[PDB]
From Swiss-Prot:
Changing V231N: In R10-3; matures to the red-emitting state with excitation and emission maxima at 555 and 585 nm, respectively. Keywords: Chromophore, Luminescence, Photoprotein. Changing D318V: In EBFP2.0; shifts the excitation and emission spectra to shorter wavelengths and increases quantum yields compared to BFP. Belongs to the GFP family. The gene is GFP. Changing I334V: In EBFP1.2; shifts the excitation and emission spectra to shorter wavelengths and increases quantum yields compared to BFP. Changing F212L: In mut3.3; shifts fluorescence lifetime from 3.03 to 1.88 ns. In R10-3; matures to the red-emitting state with excitation and emission maxima at 555 and 585 nm, respectively. It comes from Aequorea victoria. Changing M316T: Increases fluorescence at warmer temperatures such as 37 degrees Celsius. Energy-transfer acceptor. Its role is to transduce the blue chemiluminescence of the protein aequorin into green fluorescent light by energy transfer. Fluoresces in vivo upon receiving energy from the Ca(2+)-activated photoprotein aequorin. Changing Q232L: In RSGFP4; increases fluorescence and shifts the major exitation peak to 489-490 nm. Changing K242R: In Topaz; shifts the major emission and exitation peak up to 20 nm. This is Green fluorescent protein.
Amino acid sequence: SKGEELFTGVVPILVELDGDVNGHKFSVSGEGEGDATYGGSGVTQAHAAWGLKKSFQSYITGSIAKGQWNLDGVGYSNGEFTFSGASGAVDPQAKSGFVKFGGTMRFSGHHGILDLNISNPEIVFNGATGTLFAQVRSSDMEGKKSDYGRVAIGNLTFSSLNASETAASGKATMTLHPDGAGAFAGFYEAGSDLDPITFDAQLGGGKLTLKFICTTGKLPVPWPTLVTTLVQCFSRYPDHMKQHDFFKSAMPEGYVQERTIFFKDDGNYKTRAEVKFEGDTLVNRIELKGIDFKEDGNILGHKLEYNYNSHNVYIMADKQKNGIKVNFKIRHNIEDGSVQLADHYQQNTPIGDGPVLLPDNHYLSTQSALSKDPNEKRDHMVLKEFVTAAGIT
Ligand code: HEM
Ligand SMILES: [Cl-]
């Protein structure tokens, strides 16, 4: 209650980091503000899962087509192609809105004759039905390609559709829309069954707007590798989950945040930070030590794209240390099309002697966007983040 009251409005932030990675010393200063109460109806993050059609997958990888699929921005888990978005708008009261996604799926078969491309899927929904749209390029039985453009491919019928102030989710059965039947070369009929689709969206979120500058010259590691190190007290905890917000309960005295970040097939970072109020300003002061990095790896060789994915940060109580234990895996895109995993191990313990909230298991849904200030000549990073707590019904 006393800690929560400090975050009801816009709070100024100051970040100070001193690092040493493989003997390369550097310093980063950051400024900006946080609004843990920000939120509207805009989709700040979203995810969908859709197998297209189970029998179509076995066909593409079967002995008639003798083909495969290639994904750019799309994943694959539990037999479904997984997509990510960060654009849309939901009216929670009406259970209606839209979610726009990214990625491409390419299906190949018959010595290149078959070349089905479905990109950037989008959903319009209303609680009873919806439509799934996608940018579709295909080919006929003689190889000749066709551009269908943005086309309606699926008629949705929601088994469930839920929407609250901070989130929306749903699962819908699907039938082939007449407008997308041509993409399947006359093999599927309009109205025939397709795989069901599942989606979840974050509405609004605790918004961080910050700008970081390397005060020692050129940063010796990629800016994306420092995002997690560079104030989880700015997360938006829904009303029904406010008794699980450790971060704000430790304020204003603050907390110590410690991490070990293992970069797969590369070195590791060890960080110690103190996050507390210094007057009206929330300050994050960090010490970072990096060791065992490869000179020509993705980190010291600067082979990581200047972008950031959306992750789930898993939180558990640590009663014996009067704090929390946090775990998550960051996926950094590599310039060659691959992914550099950064395994995060975290501990937070209060600085003060007062009581804190020890939470039930839950997670923070984080979204980050990296950009540059066109008028800034120093090595820098502009970061915009949206974080919402979830996982407790
Ligand atoms: C040389 C050209 C092609 C030949 C000889 C061919 C042959 C076949 C055969 C024999 C099947 C039966 C599936 C089975 O029972 O296992 C089939 C199914 C199918 N074909 Fe092709 N095909 C060709 C091109 C294409 C193209 C260009 C597309 C466009 C996307 C396509 C889409 C499909 C689909 C959607 C099915 C149904 C798969 C299922 O869900 O069972 N085919 N094709
Ligand atoms: Cl960089």
